[PDB]
């Protein structure tokens, strides 16, 4: 009786814990990828500048 | 009966919880590798376009 | 009771687990993001340099 009840309480709580961990870690991930996306957006705009600048250098 | 029962149940907890810590770290590390491919591919492209442009 | 004690042990163990997995996943994500940031810093620097010498050449000419 008691062994089965504890082990099932373990199973259900553990399974909720696994979800919460991944949920929270994957949200941190999304947070860091956003920061590197912003950075890549800004790079790409700088490259677009150099492109026009290069074509203008010809002459 | 009951210290035997407490002990058995805690041993169950220990192996189940640790496997789950490992499980959660594996899936999150996988999701992160997924988001890293897309970021690194974007940067690969940018350096390629700068090199071409040069 | 034995059940109450077993379940309390389970709650502390699981809570410590959640904290540990999140910490370790996040440390991973931090190392992978730091590597890219490094790559990205080098290119930022090259671009600023190429932009200023082309923006200089334009002005001169």
Swiss-Prot record, chain C:
It is found in: Cell surface; Cell outer membrane. It comes from the Bacteria. Induction: Induced at 37 degrees Celsius by the temperature-dependent transcriptional activator LcrF (VirF). Residues 29-61 are annotated as: Outer membrane translocation of the passenger domain. Collagen-binding outer membrane protein forming a fibrillar matrix on the bacterial cell surface. Promotes initial attachment and invasion of eukaryotic cells. Also protects the bacteria by being responsible for agglutination, serum resistance, complement inactivation and phagocytosis resistance. Homotrimer; in gels migrates as monomers, dimers and homotrimers. Does not form trimers with distantly related EibA from E.coli; coexpression was lethal and one of the genes is eliminated in vivo. If the full translocator domain (368-455) is exchanged with that of EibA ('299-392'), will form heterotrimers with EibA and vice-versa. Belongs to the autotransporter-2 (AT-2) (TC 1.B.40) family. The signal peptide, cleaved at the inner membrane, guides the autotransporter protein to the periplasmic space. Then, trimerization and insertion of the C-terminal translocator domain in the outer membrane forms a hydrophilic pore for the translocation of the passenger domain to the bacterial cell surface. Presents a lollipop-shaped form which consists of three domains: a C-terminal membrane-anchor domain, a coiled-coil stalk domain and an oval N-terminal head domain. The N-terminal half of the sequence reveals the presence of repeated motifs with the consensus sequence NSVAIGXXS. This is Adhesin YadA. The chain holds residues 336 to 396 of 455 of the full protein.
